Amino acid sequence: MDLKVVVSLSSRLYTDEIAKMQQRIGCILPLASTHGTQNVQGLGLGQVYSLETVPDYVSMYNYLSDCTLAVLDEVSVDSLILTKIVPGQTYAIKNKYQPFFQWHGTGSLSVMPPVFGREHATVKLESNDVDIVFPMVLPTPIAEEVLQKIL
Amino acid sequence: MDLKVVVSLSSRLYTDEIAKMQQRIGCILPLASTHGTQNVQGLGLGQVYSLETVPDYVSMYNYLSDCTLAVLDEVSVDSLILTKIVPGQTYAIKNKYQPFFQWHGTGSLSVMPPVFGREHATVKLESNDVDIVFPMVLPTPIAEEVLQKIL
Amino acid sequence: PTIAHGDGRRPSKQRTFIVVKNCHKHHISTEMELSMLDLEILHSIPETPVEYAEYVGAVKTVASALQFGVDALERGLINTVLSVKLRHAPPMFILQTLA
Amino acid sequence: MKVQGSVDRRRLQRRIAGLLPPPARRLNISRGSEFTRDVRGLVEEHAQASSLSAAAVWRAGLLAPGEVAVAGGGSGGGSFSWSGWRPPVFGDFLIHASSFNNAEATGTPLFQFKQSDPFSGVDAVFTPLSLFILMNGGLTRMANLLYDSPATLADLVPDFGRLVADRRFHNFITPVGPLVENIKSTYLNKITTVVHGPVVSKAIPRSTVKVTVPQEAFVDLDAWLSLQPCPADARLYVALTYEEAGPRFTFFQSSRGHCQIMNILRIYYSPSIMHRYAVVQPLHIEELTFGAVACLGTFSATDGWRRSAFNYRGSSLPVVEIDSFYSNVSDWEVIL
Question: Which chains touch B (3 or more CB pairs under 8 A)?
Answer without folding.
Answer: A, C, D
